[PDB]
Amino acid sequence: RLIYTAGGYFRQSLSYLEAYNPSDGTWLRLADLQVPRSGLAGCVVGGLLYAVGGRNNSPDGNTDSSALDCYNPMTNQWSPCAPMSVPRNRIGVGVIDGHIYAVGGSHGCIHHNSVERYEPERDEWHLVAPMLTRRIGVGVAVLNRLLYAVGGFDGTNRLNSAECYYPERNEWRMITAMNTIRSGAGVCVLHNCIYAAGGYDGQDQLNSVERYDVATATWTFVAPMKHRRSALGITVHQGRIYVLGGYDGHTFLDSVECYDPDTDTWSEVTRMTSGRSGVGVAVT
């Protein structure tokens, strides 16, 4: 299994699809995205890598994207899917029972609270209950088949609040808020906890990391990462967290850091071939 990073933005939206091999340290250059996109999200269903939403920021235009695209590692080809009902830049996504939930994001100055669900076996999107909060730059994680939306930016304020979607009741419920306000953080599930790493609080890019325990309903803070970063990509590979790229207020980072939970330590393990922020990332 490899860590795939798709899209991103290094002063313009990017088409790169690259795959990292934590074992031999190699970066594999795969098929370009059909359209350059940043602020997208990545996920995996079946063995298929999906790129969701984002925005095409190009020297001749600036269009937020409703698109869903599917990459097959067995053919090294991209294929389009049915698009979401609205464009969603700085989207969050989670996977539950083989269905892709697209959460939040922006379309122009519209900041979405709407959420929609993609079924790959019918190739179709349907709207579910909207969030309690408009969130762009929202982190999304799935724990025990419940969908968590964490932090983000509602158009006026950045958020430390988090809410939880129950698919069986089609309703959102507020949970305990994070310790720190974070937009553009990396949010993932590791072991049985939700991690929120980095982000932007409206004043500084953050290196802090905190994890939510459902049993205690408490957001604990763990060892901070080496480099402050917002709009970072994040994923879990072989029981460790990987954060990729991001923006630190000056530079688009190519640093990749890896978190080992048994030692509560962050290690810098590789550099991307080129610095970038707002990537989608997944493992397949």
Side-chain angles (χ1 to χ4, degrees), residues 159 168 191 217 221 254:
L159 315 163
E168 73 144 290
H191 288 335
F221 262 157
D254 60 2

Side-chain angles (χ1 to χ4, degrees), residues 173-200:
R173 276 315 221 85
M174 200 77 64
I175 69 162
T176 311
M178 289 187 292
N179 295 286
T180 306
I181 290 182
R182 305 174 189 271
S183 68
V187 167
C188 69
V189 53
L190 174 59
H191 288 335
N192 269 288
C193 302
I194 298 164
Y195 289 70
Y200 178 57

Side-chain angles (χ1 to χ4, degrees), residues 124-141:
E124 65 185 35
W125 290 91
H126 302 269
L127 276 149
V128 301
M131 287 180 298
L132 303 164
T133 319
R134 309 180 172 277
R135 305 178 188 269
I136 87 162
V138 54
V140 173

Side-chain angles (χ1 to χ4, degrees), residues 6 13 15 25 54 89 102 125 138 148 151 164 197 201 210 223 243 252 259 261:
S13 306
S15 288
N89 184 31
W125 290 91
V138 54
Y148 295 82
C164 178
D201 66 13
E210 51 187 309
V243 300
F252 293 81
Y259 178 78

Side-chain angles (χ1 to χ4, degrees), residues 23-59 61-155:
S23 276
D24 63 11
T26 205
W27 276 106
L28 222 59
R29 178 76 182 275
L30 308 171
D32 274 0
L33 285 158
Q34 178 66 34
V35 183
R37 304 141 71 171
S38 58
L40 73 166
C43 65
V44 167
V45 188
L48 296 175
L49 166 72
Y50 291 80
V52 198
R55 142 187 285 255
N56 181 4
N57 231 55
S58 279
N62 299 305
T63 299
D64 296 317
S65 164
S66 67
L68 177 66
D69 297 279
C70 179
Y71 175 83
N72 188 348
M74 293 276 80
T75 65
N76 191 43
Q77 294 171 15
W78 288 94
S79 181
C81 308
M84 293 170 301
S85 67
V86 296
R88 295 182 186 274
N89 184 31
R90 307 186 54 97
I91 188 179
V93 305
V95 176
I96 303 182
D97 290 335
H99 297 190
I100 300 173
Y101 288 86
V103 174
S106 66
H107 176 208
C109 270
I110 297 172
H111 297 69
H112 302 310
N113 56 29
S114 55
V115 182
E116 46 192 300
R117 183 189 38 99
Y118 177 72
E119 308 182 44
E121 322 70 12
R122 305 151 72 64
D123 180 48
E124 65 185 35
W125 290 91
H126 302 269
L127 276 149
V128 301
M131 287 180 298
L132 303 164
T133 319
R134 309 180 172 277
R135 305 178 188 269
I136 87 162
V138 54
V140 173
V142 172
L143 186 53
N144 304 154
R145 288 167 59 248
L146 299 185
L147 184 85
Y148 295 82
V150 176
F153 177 57
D154 69 12

Side-chain angles (χ1 to χ4, degrees), residues 6-10 12-24:
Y9 167 109
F10 178 54
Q12 81 155 56
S13 306
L14 310 168
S15 288
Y16 305 140
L17 178 66
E18 286 166 317
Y20 177 59
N21 182 324
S23 276
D24 63 11

